[PDB]
């Protein structure tokens, strides 16, 4: 008697991620007027502002995609 | 008797991220006016101002992407 | 008696990222008219500020792409 | 007398890990009230440690803060 | 009298890990009350130790605190 | 009187690490309030260790803060 391997697998798979904004129309967007006033206001302390009439904030830190293989062909241990 | 092993494994597969701000369509995006008027004001501490009509922000920590193949062919231990 | 061993694997795979801003049209953008005014005002600590009509900001400290391969053939310890 | 046959042979192959996305936005105001110490006719006949003060503070923001401890000891009569 | 064998041999695959998306947007404000110490005719005939004090504060914010701790020990008569 | 054998041969290929995507954005704004120290007719008959301020203040923030402590030892009669 007499012995034939053909270890022979294909691989053909997608491992795709898509995150965040995308494919997106965005038709004529318009921002209101934006009017801020401000009189003998104290601040004793941190001041964080943000003022704007439109804005677009895409934060991704997601996504993350992997792929393993391990495999082996054991002949006799 | 004799003994063949034919080893051909293959790959052909993706691994791919697409993250943040793709494929968008912004069309004539219009701005606000913005106005900002301040008077008499203390500040005792630290202030910090982001004043903007129209903002596009894109941050991407993430889409990080990786393959690991392990292979091997044993004979006889 | 006689043994043949054909170790012979192929990889044509792809590792790839797309991280950001990609393939985006932006068509006439117009930041509204910015208008900042002051008066009196007192700062007694760091002041950080940021004034503009129409900013596009991208960051990326992701995407980062690796692949790995380890393979052997072994033949009677 | 037969002999004292010691075999101290320990194998570590451990991992002590941490992955961290973002460590941030920390807004940390601490803060002392008034300390009044008053003494009149003390005695002291040995060491006198002593600490005054309004404030003692540690801020401590490692990326990673992570430990391994280890004691090995071996001890003969 | 017969022979005395001892074989100290631990084997450690062991694992101690952390993953965080974020860790952030932390607001402390610890506040110590005044204090106030007064002290008339007392008599010390050995060590002092003496701390006064109106906050004492730690904080501690690791991206992972992560700890093994191990004692290996052998003692032979 | 029979031989004594000690082999001290341990191991260690333990790894302690650490990932972090951003450490930042940290307003640190301790505050000691006032100290006051009055005394009269002490007697202090050894050593004196005194410490008097109204702060005291770390502020650590390491891009990895990771520890490794090891103690081996071996003792005979």
Same mark, same amino acid.
């Given at each position: 008697?007499?012995?034939?391997?053909?270890?022979?697998? #294909?691989?053909?798979?997608?491992?795709?991620?898509?995150?965040?904004?995308?494919?997106?129309? +965005? +038709?004529?967007?318009?921002?209101?007027? #934006? =009017? #801020?006033?401000? =009189?003998?206001?104290?601040?004793?302390?941190?001041?964080?502002?943000?003022?704007?009439?439109?804005?677009?904030?895409?934060?991704?830190?997601?996504?993350?995609?992997?792929?393993? =293989?391990?495999?082996?062909?054991?002949?006799?241990?």
């Amino acid at each position: 008697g007499s012995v034939q391997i053909v270890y022979k697998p #294909v691989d053909l798979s997608k491992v795709t991620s898509k995150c965040g904004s995308l494919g997106n129309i +965005h +038709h004529k967007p318009g921002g209101g007027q #934006v =009017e #801020v006033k401000s =009189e003998k206001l104290d601040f004793k302390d941190r001041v964080q502002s943000k003022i704007g009439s439109l804005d677009n904030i895409t934060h991704v830190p997601g996504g993350g995609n992997k792929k393993i =293989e391990t495999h082996k062909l054991t002949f006799r241990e």
